[PDB]
Amino acid sequence: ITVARKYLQTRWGLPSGRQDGVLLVALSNEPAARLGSEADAKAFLDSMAQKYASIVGVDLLEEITKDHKVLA
Amino acid sequence: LITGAGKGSIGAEVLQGLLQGGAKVVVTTSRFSKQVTDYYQSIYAKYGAKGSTLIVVPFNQGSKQDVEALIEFIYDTEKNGGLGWDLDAIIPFAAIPEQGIELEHIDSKSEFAHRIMLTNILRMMGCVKKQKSARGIETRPAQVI
Amino acid sequence: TRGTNNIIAEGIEKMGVRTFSQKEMAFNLLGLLTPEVVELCQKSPVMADLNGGLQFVPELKEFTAKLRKELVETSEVRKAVSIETALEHKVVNGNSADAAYAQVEIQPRANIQLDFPELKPYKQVKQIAPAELEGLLDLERVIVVTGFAEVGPWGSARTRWEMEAFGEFSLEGCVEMAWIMGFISYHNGNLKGRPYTGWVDSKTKEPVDDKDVKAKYETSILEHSGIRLIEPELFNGYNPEKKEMIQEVIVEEDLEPFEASKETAEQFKHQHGDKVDIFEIPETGEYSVKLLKGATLYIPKALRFDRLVAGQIPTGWNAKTYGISDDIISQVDPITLFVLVSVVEAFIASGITDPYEMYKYVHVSEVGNCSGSGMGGVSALRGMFKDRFKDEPVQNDILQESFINTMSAWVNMLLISSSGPIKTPVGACATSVESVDIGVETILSGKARICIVGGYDDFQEEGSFEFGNMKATSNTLEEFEHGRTPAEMSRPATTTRNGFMEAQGAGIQIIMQADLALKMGVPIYGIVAMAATATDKIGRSVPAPGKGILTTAREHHSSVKYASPNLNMKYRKRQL
Amino acid sequence: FQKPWFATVNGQARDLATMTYEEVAKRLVELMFIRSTNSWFDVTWRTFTGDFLRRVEERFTKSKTLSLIQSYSLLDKPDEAIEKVFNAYPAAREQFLNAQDIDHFLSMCQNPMQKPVPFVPVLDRRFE
Amino acid sequence: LRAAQQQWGNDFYKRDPRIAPLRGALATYGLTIDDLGVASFHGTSTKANDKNESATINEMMKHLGRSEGNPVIGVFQKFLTGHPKGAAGAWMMNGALQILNSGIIPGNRNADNVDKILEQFEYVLYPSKTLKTDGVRAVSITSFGFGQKGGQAIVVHPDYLYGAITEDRYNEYVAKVSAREKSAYKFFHNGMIYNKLFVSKEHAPYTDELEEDVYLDPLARVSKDKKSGSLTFNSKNIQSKDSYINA
Amino acid sequence: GVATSFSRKKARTFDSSWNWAKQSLLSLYFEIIHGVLKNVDREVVSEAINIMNRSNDALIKFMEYHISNTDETKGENYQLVKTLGEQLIENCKQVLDVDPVYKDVAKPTGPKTAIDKNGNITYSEEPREKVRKLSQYVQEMALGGPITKESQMDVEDALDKDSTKEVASLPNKSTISKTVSST
């Protein structure tokens, strides 16, 4: 739920209470199976934030170091 | 022992005869199915005389290994999982239809067909000879039609 | 030899040569096995000409070939000349004068029938039973079967009886099977422009004629009903070849931490204590869960099982198509759906179209339900014992549906509305007969005048496995080893019988007072003239069959010199 | 009214799914074949009842054979024609109209290229 | 009168030890032991069951005096449908009714070879093919279950019932049944085509405020409503003088 | 094509003539009653042969019960079953303690081709004009035809006229002096 908000905010620009709406819309549309790809889970969060978009009425490298620090 | 006695054949007419006379017969089938199992139960429940018994086994007269395996299962004591029999007749009518094959067409099929229709028939007679002989059976020839 | 190129047989024979039927050659060959020619063989090899003189006909190849050519030519000229004189007619004499001269073929459609029983002229009726019988019987105490239905591997009572008694379906067979199995769906409206009224392939939505249903579907219909390989789609994925189980292991070195909710992390710490660390991630509010060395883990693994075949309801059966609401479908255990559908189909078989018509003839308190189950609700049982154990989402009243008497409850709550008796039998593999006993008795005591009788059980993963453990069911791996197709693995009284084949479904019948049946004017399919249950003796093997039921033949022969007037109807009738 | 309720059999009110194949064929002839002029008042109405009798054959036959109404001209003696059909398929006198044939019948009533049928076959939305 | 009918017609053998249950069951309709034509075996296809069941059926025939040479013809429908534990007896009870009313005895089509053991049971006949007979008089459904749960049922042909009733009454009956069949053929093809076969009842025949009044009047019965046309209990038929008069 | 097919476990053995015989007979029986087999059909003779081929002290008590319990009165078909039945019961009594025999009674046939008036080639198998018994077939064989040049008895059958009568004949060993070889 941590990663799913940092995606909703990075790629779809959603603050604290606006990503609360996108999670609540995804709760009514919950998959009847676990999503396979992380890209399938990203694509799911996409369409869920646009069903929130027209229900609220709103429209729409450090990562290299991150891989190394993990190692250390 | 009778090979080639599938439905609608000279085989199956000879088989009905044998059963009607009270013979104990092993029939080979190549296409061993429910459909075929059901055929023979029908045939037996019609012509199966007192003292008769029909045994259907799947078989491929083209396999050396099947020829050997079959007539071994025939001679082997019931205890050892066999039939415990000793053949009095062999009717090796098993075959494959070769048509439209002339001299220069003789190939994989015909060479295989020749095996079923000659070489393995020899092998089969040879097999029951060894069995009888290995048992001192000198006064019970099997007739080969 | 002619048998299943004989066209020239008559011709070759026209030369004093004989051709033979197979029965003839077989007779000839068999004649070489006669003692006489057998001993001949033993003296020195015998050679038998069983070739009816063909030897003598010269240039046989070419002669043969000629006959064939002359035939084939005579055929092809004769057919070519006729096809041309026939076109010359359509030219000279118009194709509209010949068009009103062809006849119209009529093609059959399926008229499925309820197949009620036949009532003979009373003259013939009174010839069956003794004339003394008239009015001898209190018809208020003759238990009679008024309707029946089933849901099972072979469809309904109609299609199953057809397969059992005949071995192939009629037109009404396929059309009904295709319908229950979902292959065809009814349509009435416009089909791409023109109007249509009839069957439609439900996948393609194209029209289908009754006379075609067989060619189009039966091949597949047959493949997907009866005793066949277990289709995991029909059982939430139960796959006898890869059977899911978990094993316990102790973690030998600290697992790597994973993120989790606060509520969830606490449920872990509650469980593991010294053997797990959970810590709040101050930024998100959520916790990290780290399983230390010493902790207990469940690691999934798979098991290959022996029972690969069951008698399953035809693939595509759907309580939705019998007309059952989605809400019920959800709420209920599969077995209740079987039961519901048959109670409906059984009332139909009895010509009771609205259950409340009973309440025209009877009081609310005199319609009962004595249907029973061996296990019943095996599916809700799992959700309760296993699906809960995994914290999987499962209903809050799966307990309801697990009970055996709740099937009868939904029947009464959705359909019947009776305040009659409700005695529910558990009789393992005989709950159904015991049910009839219980039914019969309840009517003979005045407690009910109509009641529902029958049995039902479902096939599920844990059921089949435990039977396999009792060594009760047939071993499919072994059946295959013996050359046995699935349709062949249930063979009672056979030399090779090897264990029983498991199945699923339900079957109920409606029973009634003979007197009431006559008055209502429903069909009468038979008389339940006796029904008994009996225990065996002292033992220690529960799954064992016995001879308790032999007691239904118990009569005392210590004195049988002279005839008992009691047996004599003529006598009894006078006394009455 | 000039359009009777079709599924009324000898004064007896009833519905279309509670008539037998005979009752319908006889009701058809009754309302479309004008007795006094020994004539089908409209050729489409003769065509109609033919299509219906043909259907009767289709339903009740067991195997495939050929129609007893090869040409609808045979309907010009309606009574005789009807008896021919139902003699062959006697069962059709005793059974109510198959549920699926009701849809059919009502569909023919909606066929353009046919003089509007002289009755009301159904109480429903298009009753006006 | 009903009790006299009972004493001499229905239950004459109850208190008799020389008349077995099975005997008298058939005997009340003028049927002999030999009349039980078909035995619907449980036929579990297990070695344990099939032998036992044959033996036990054999003995109940032997004890009661089944004519030497008249075996019961056994069906084994588990061969086609399998074994659904609980639903077993019912399926066999159906096939039994269908056998009675058709005269057809289906064949154990999976009987490649009858177990030689079973030859001793000279009162049982194991057919591998269907026999279309000129009549079946009575079938015997027997079934066995875990926990020594044994059970038998005897189903007698319907036409023996009509013997015990007046001709005028029988004729009146045939009338009603005929009308039902027509109206049921109606219903069935409706619900098949339109998936209307099951139609959940959304109300009881009694209003909630009438529920108790119905449970307590034994003569309360349903009548077609005017408005709805469906079957309800009326205030005027509950505890009525008219329903004591007409009863 | 040379792959293996035989395994011992796939063998199926058929034993129970004792049971198929009661069935064989209880079938001929309903079939005559229902008139599928009429007293002309050769099938009743064939099937007689197969029933006799399985005489038990037990098969007898079977036919005995079922035959003696038929109501001759019930119909013309019922008398037939009963008469044939009794005849069959008699024969079985004799063939008890007697070797089973292969005897083909089928009606002998020959080839017949016919081409339509519209070029439709059709093949039938017709009964041979001058051949009716397998007996007559052997005689036909021994005479040969004119085409075999250089070298290198009338026993009227009740055959397709009265099956029950022929059935009564079955148990009786034919004595012949005029050996067919001498024809």
Tab-separated table of N, CA and C in Angstrom, chain E residues 62-139:
chain	number	residue	atom	x	y	z
E	62	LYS	N	-34.977	-67.609	-1.747
E	62	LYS	CA	-34.932	-69.018	-1.380
E	62	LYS	C	-35.868	-69.336	-0.205
E	63	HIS	N	-35.814	-68.512	0.841
E	63	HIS	CA	-36.621	-68.730	2.043
E	63	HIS	C	-38.121	-68.633	1.752
E	64	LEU	N	-38.507	-67.702	0.891
E	64	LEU	CA	-39.921	-67.448	0.650
E	64	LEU	C	-40.552	-68.363	-0.401
E	65	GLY	N	-39.733	-69.152	-1.077
E	65	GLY	CA	-40.268	-70.177	-1.946
E	65	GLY	C	-40.321	-69.803	-3.406
E	66	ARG	N	-39.398	-68.945	-3.826
E	66	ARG	CA	-39.271	-68.552	-5.228
E	66	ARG	C	-39.138	-69.846	-6.013
E	67	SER	N	-39.947	-69.988	-7.066
E	67	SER	CA	-39.922	-71.191	-7.907
E	67	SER	C	-38.540	-71.427	-8.470
E	68	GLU	N	-38.035	-72.648	-8.315
E	68	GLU	CA	-36.780	-73.006	-8.942
E	68	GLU	C	-36.944	-72.702	-10.415
E	69	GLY	N	-36.011	-71.931	-10.967
E	69	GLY	CA	-36.009	-71.643	-12.386
E	69	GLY	C	-36.495	-70.245	-12.707
E	70	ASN	N	-37.044	-69.563	-11.710
E	70	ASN	CA	-37.470	-68.180	-11.875
E	70	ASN	C	-36.581	-67.218	-11.111
E	71	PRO	N	-35.457	-66.804	-11.706
E	71	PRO	CA	-34.588	-65.906	-10.956
E	71	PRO	C	-35.112	-64.473	-11.009
E	72	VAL	N	-34.634	-63.628	-10.108
E	72	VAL	CA	-34.889	-62.209	-10.222
E	72	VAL	C	-33.875	-61.653	-11.207
E	73	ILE	N	-34.320	-60.739	-12.049
E	73	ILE	CA	-33.419	-60.140	-13.003
E	73	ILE	C	-32.876	-58.886	-12.365
E	74	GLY	N	-31.564	-58.858	-12.179
E	74	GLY	CA	-30.929	-57.749	-11.498
E	74	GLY	C	-30.357	-56.680	-12.407
E	75	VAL	N	-30.676	-55.435	-12.083
E	75	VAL	CA	-30.090	-54.292	-12.760
E	75	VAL	C	-29.029	-53.681	-11.850
E	76	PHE	N	-28.073	-52.964	-12.427
E	76	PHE	CA	-26.956	-52.433	-11.651
E	76	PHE	C	-26.615	-51.044	-12.132
E	77	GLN	N	-27.549	-50.110	-11.974
E	77	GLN	CA	-27.453	-48.794	-12.629
E	77	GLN	C	-26.246	-47.927	-12.226
E	78	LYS	N	-25.554	-48.310	-11.168
E	78	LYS	CA	-24.327	-47.626	-10.805
E	78	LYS	C	-23.277	-47.703	-11.923
E	79	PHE	N	-23.471	-48.611	-12.874
E	79	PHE	CA	-22.511	-48.799	-13.966
E	79	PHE	C	-22.505	-47.605	-14.917
E	80	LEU	N	-23.633	-46.904	-14.966
E	80	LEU	CA	-23.833	-45.802	-15.902
E	80	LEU	C	-23.670	-44.466	-15.195
E	81	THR	N	-24.184	-44.390	-13.971
E	81	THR	CA	-24.274	-43.119	-13.263
E	81	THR	C	-23.189	-42.947	-12.210
E	82	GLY	N	-22.598	-44.053	-11.781
E	82	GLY	CA	-21.635	-44.015	-10.698
E	82	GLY	C	-22.341	-44.156	-9.365
E	83	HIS	N	-21.660	-43.784	-8.287
E	83	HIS	CA	-22.206	-43.966	-6.947
E	83	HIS	C	-22.148	-42.683	-6.120
E	84	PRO	N	-23.284	-41.972	-6.032
E	84	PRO	CA	-23.405	-40.681	-5.351
E	84	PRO	C	-23.804	-40.840	-3.892
E	85	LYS	N	-23.224	-41.820	-3.208
E	85	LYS	CA	-23.538	-42.079	-1.805
E	85	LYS	C	-25.030	-41.954	-1.482
E	86	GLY	N	-25.451	-40.768	-1.056
E	86	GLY	CA	-26.820	-40.556	-0.618
E	86	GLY	C	-27.877	-40.659	-1.703
E	87	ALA	N	-27.585	-40.102	-2.873
E	87	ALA	CA	-28.561	-40.053	-3.955
E	87	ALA	C	-28.737	-41.400	-4.657
E	88	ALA	N	-28.038	-42.423	-4.176
E	88	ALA	CA	-28.100	-43.745	-4.797
E	88	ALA	C	-29.514	-44.304	-4.842
E	89	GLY	N	-30.073	-44.568	-3.667
E	89	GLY	CA	-31.397	-45.159	-3.575
E	89	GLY	C	-32.455	-44.511	-4.454
E	90	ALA	N	-32.376	-43.190	-4.603
E	90	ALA	CA	-33.401	-42.422	-5.299
E	90	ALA	C	-33.328	-42.642	-6.786
E	91	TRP	N	-32.118	-42.547	-7.317
E	91	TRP	CA	-31.859	-42.809	-8.713
E	91	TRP	C	-32.372	-44.192	-9.122
E	92	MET	N	-32.198	-45.162	-8.224
E	92	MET	CA	-32.613	-46.538	-8.466
E	92	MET	C	-34.122	-46.680	-8.329
E	93	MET	N	-34.697	-45.799	-7.523
E	93	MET	CA	-36.127	-45.743	-7.295
E	93	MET	C	-36.821	-45.153	-8.506
E	94	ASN	N	-36.131	-44.239	-9.176
E	94	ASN	CA	-36.613	-43.683	-10.426
E	94	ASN	C	-36.589	-44.747	-11.495
E	95	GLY	N	-35.417	-45.329	-11.727
E	95	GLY	CA	-35.267	-46.361	-12.738
E	95	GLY	C	-36.233	-47.505	-12.522
E	96	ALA	N	-36.580	-47.729	-11.269
E	96	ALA	CA	-37.522	-48.775	-10.929
E	96	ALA	C	-38.933	-48.407	-11.402
E	97	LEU	N	-39.352	-47.180	-11.128
E	97	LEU	CA	-40.626	-46.683	-11.625
E	97	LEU	C	-40.657	-46.707	-13.151
E	98	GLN	N	-39.574	-46.286	-13.790
E	98	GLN	CA	-39.498	-46.271	-15.246
E	98	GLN	C	-39.547	-47.687	-15.823
E	99	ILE	N	-38.969	-48.639	-15.097
E	99	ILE	CA	-39.016	-50.038	-15.487
E	99	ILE	C	-40.452	-50.545	-15.410
E	100	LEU	N	-41.113	-50.283	-14.288
E	100	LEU	CA	-42.484	-50.738	-14.080
E	100	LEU	C	-43.398	-50.283	-15.187
E	101	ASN	N	-43.312	-49.004	-15.512
E	101	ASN	CA	-44.209	-48.374	-16.477
E	101	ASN	C	-43.805	-48.536	-17.955
E	102	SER	N	-42.719	-49.257	-18.218
E	102	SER	CA	-42.253	-49.446	-19.584
E	102	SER	C	-42.099	-50.920	-19.938
E	103	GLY	N	-42.063	-51.776	-18.930
E	103	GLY	CA	-41.839	-53.192	-19.151
E	103	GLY	C	-40.429	-53.518	-19.602
E	104	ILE	N	-39.587	-52.490	-19.709
E	104	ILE	CA	-38.203	-52.651	-20.140
E	104	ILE	C	-37.253	-52.772	-18.966
E	105	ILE	N	-36.446	-53.819	-19.000
E	105	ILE	CA	-35.424	-54.022	-18.003
E	105	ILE	C	-34.095	-53.768	-18.676
E	106	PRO	N	-33.399	-52.689	-18.272
E	106	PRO	CA	-32.133	-52.292	-18.892
E	106	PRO	C	-31.049	-53.290	-18.557
E	107	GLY	N	-29.978	-53.304	-19.341
E	107	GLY	CA	-28.939	-54.295	-19.168
E	107	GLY	C	-27.673	-53.719	-18.585
E	108	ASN	N	-27.093	-54.416	-17.603
E	108	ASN	CA	-25.760	-54.097	-17.104
E	108	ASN	C	-24.760	-54.190	-18.248
E	109	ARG	N	-24.626	-53.111	-19.003
E	109	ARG	CA	-23.821	-53.110	-20.212
E	109	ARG	C	-22.330	-53.215	-19.945
E	110	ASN	N	-21.950	-53.177	-18.668
E	110	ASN	CA	-20.541	-53.313	-18.289
E	110	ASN	C	-20.214	-54.667	-17.689
E	111	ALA	N	-21.130	-55.607	-17.861
E	111	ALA	CA	-20.917	-56.977	-17.434
E	111	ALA	C	-20.207	-57.744	-18.533
E	112	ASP	N	-18.907	-57.531	-18.646
E	112	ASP	CA	-18.095	-58.279	-19.586
E	112	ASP	C	-18.177	-59.747	-19.218
E	113	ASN	N	-18.108	-60.019	-17.924
E	113	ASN	CA	-18.087	-61.384	-17.436
E	113	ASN	C	-18.568	-61.504	-16.010
E	114	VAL	N	-19.695	-62.181	-15.820
E	114	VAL	CA	-20.255	-62.341	-14.493
E	114	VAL	C	-19.351	-63.203	-13.630
E	115	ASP	N	-19.019	-62.684	-12.447
E	115	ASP	CA	-18.134	-63.350	-11.500
E	115	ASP	C	-18.585	-64.778	-11.223
E	116	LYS	N	-17.702	-65.725	-11.531
E	116	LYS	CA	-18.017	-67.145	-11.437
E	116	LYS	C	-18.520	-67.545	-10.053
E	117	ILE	N	-18.113	-66.793	-9.033
E	117	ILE	CA	-18.589	-67.014	-7.669
E	117	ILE	C	-20.111	-66.998	-7.670
E	118	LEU	N	-20.660	-65.967	-8.303
E	118	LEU	CA	-22.097	-65.725	-8.340
E	118	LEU	C	-22.977	-66.815	-8.987
E	119	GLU	N	-22.368	-67.879	-9.506
E	119	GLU	CA	-23.150	-68.930	-10.158
E	119	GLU	C	-24.001	-69.685	-9.152
E	120	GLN	N	-23.495	-69.757	-7.933
E	120	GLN	CA	-24.179	-70.428	-6.834
E	120	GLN	C	-25.536	-69.831	-6.502
E	121	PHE	N	-25.720	-68.561	-6.841
E	121	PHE	CA	-26.967	-67.872	-6.514
E	121	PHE	C	-27.978	-68.043	-7.628
E	122	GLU	N	-28.586	-69.229	-7.665
E	122	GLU	CA	-29.409	-69.652	-8.793
E	122	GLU	C	-30.697	-68.848	-8.911
E	123	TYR	N	-30.956	-67.999	-7.920
E	123	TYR	CA	-32.128	-67.128	-7.958
E	123	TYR	C	-31.834	-65.730	-8.510
E	124	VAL	N	-30.616	-65.511	-8.991
E	124	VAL	CA	-30.254	-64.218	-9.582
E	124	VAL	C	-29.773	-64.354	-11.033
E	125	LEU	N	-30.234	-63.442	-11.893
E	125	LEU	CA	-29.874	-63.440	-13.312
E	125	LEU	C	-29.294	-62.089	-13.668
E	126	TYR	N	-28.066	-62.077	-14.180
E	126	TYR	CA	-27.335	-60.832	-14.420
E	126	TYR	C	-27.266	-60.524	-15.909
E	127	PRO	N	-28.193	-59.707	-16.421
E	127	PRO	CA	-28.254	-59.491	-17.870
E	127	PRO	C	-27.220	-58.473	-18.293
E	128	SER	N	-26.613	-58.669	-19.462
E	128	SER	CA	-25.669	-57.712	-20.022
E	128	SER	C	-26.351	-56.853	-21.077
E	129	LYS	N	-27.572	-57.219	-21.446
E	129	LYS	CA	-28.299	-56.463	-22.462
E	129	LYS	C	-29.748	-56.216	-22.078
E	130	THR	N	-30.306	-55.140	-22.617
E	130	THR	CA	-31.669	-54.727	-22.288
E	130	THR	C	-32.727	-55.731	-22.761
E	131	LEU	N	-33.661	-56.094	-21.882
E	131	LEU	CA	-34.781	-56.969	-22.252
E	131	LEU	C	-36.088	-56.196	-22.249
E	132	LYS	N	-36.703	-56.070	-23.419
E	132	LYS	CA	-38.029	-55.473	-23.506
E	132	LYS	C	-39.061	-56.590	-23.290
E	133	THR	N	-39.654	-56.611	-22.096
E	133	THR	CA	-40.548	-57.691	-21.683
E	133	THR	C	-41.996	-57.321	-21.970
E	134	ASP	N	-42.917	-58.245	-21.685
E	134	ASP	CA	-44.345	-57.975	-21.873
E	134	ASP	C	-44.978	-57.477	-20.588
E	135	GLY	N	-44.150	-57.265	-19.566
E	135	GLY	CA	-44.606	-56.656	-18.325
E	135	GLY	C	-43.703	-56.908	-17.138
E	136	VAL	N	-43.569	-55.901	-16.268
E	136	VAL	CA	-42.903	-56.058	-14.971
E	136	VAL	C	-43.917	-55.744	-13.874
E	137	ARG	N	-43.997	-56.604	-12.861
E	137	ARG	CA	-45.021	-56.455	-11.822
E	137	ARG	C	-44.545	-55.746	-10.571
E	138	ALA	N	-43.285	-55.962	-10.200
E	138	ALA	CA	-42.723	-55.366	-8.990
E	138	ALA	C	-41.210	-55.378	-9.014
E	139	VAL	N	-40.604	-54.245	-8.655
E	139	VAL	CA	-39.152	-54.142	-8.502
E	139	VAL	C	-38.740	-54.083	-7.034
